């Protein structure tokens, strides 16, 4: 099993957008920003054990950071990971 | 490399001088030969890359003393 100390550090934020919103209200999937080194077994286990719901399957993409600039000083943001967590028929959150 | 295993003779450097004294670099090489030495105390042939005066010093000092020197300074035979 995955230890609970690992399993708390994985989920990072709920992702709020309109693709996320239509995924919730149309296909049971909650979209959430996860740890960059988090595997699909860790995300599945962490939503099973931290929101106490039943997860059908996880799909993970990794989002690349945008090169912004302040003034005349550039900088890339930071890569993050986004997990499309497809729940079962019985869920709320 | 061309090093005598007994006396430790490297190749050294020098000059070809000519009759007009034109200096050119050269190497003096040792007279290295690979000879197979019978040791009676071990009843074996230990083959070494000796000079042709490493064989003089083996003829004088004996092969056992020489092998004790090579084993002493970590030269593997």
């Amino acid at each position: 099993m995955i230890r609970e100390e690992r399993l708390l550090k994985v989920l990072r934020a709920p992702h709020v957008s309109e693709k996320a919103s239509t995924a919730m209200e149309k296909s049971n999937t909650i979209v959430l920003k996860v740890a960059k080194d988090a595997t699909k077994a860790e995300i599945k286990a962490a939503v099973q054990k931290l929101f106490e719901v039943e997860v059908e399957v996880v799909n993970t993409l990794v989002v690349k950071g945008k090169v912004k600039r302040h003034g005349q000083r550039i900088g890339r943001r930071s890569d993050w990971k986004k997990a499309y967590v497809t729940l079962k028929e019985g869920q709320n959150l | 490399s061309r090093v005598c295993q007994v006396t430790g003779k490297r190749p050294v450097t020098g000059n070809n001088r000519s009759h007009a004294l034109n200096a050119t670099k050269r190497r003096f090489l040792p007279n290295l030969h690979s000879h197979r030495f019978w040791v009676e105390s071990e009843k074996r042939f230990v083959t070494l890359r000796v000079s042709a005066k490493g064989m003089r010093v083996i003829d004088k000092k004996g092969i056992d003393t020489v092998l004790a020197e090579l084993r002493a300074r970590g030269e593997k035979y």
Partner: protein
């Protein structure tokens, strides 16, 4: 809270360890990033408090 954590057993710092991570830390990351959580200093003090529990836990366990 530095002597207070210093005077428990290893099992009890594992309990308040898992409760610093569980109850405090995760619920404040989720609460912070969902528009709630006016009080942002809690994130800092929880994080440093987990540092204390892991410090005393390393000092208590063995060397």
């Amino acid at each position: 809270m530095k002597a207070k954590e210093l005077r428990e057993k290893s099992v009890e710092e594992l309990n308040t360890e898992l409760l610093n991570l569980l109850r405090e830390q995760f619920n404040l990351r989720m609460q912070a990033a969902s528009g709630q959580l006016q009080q942002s200093h809690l994130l800092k003090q929880v994080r440093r408090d987990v540092a204390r529990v892991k410090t005393l836990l390393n000092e208590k366990a063995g060397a």
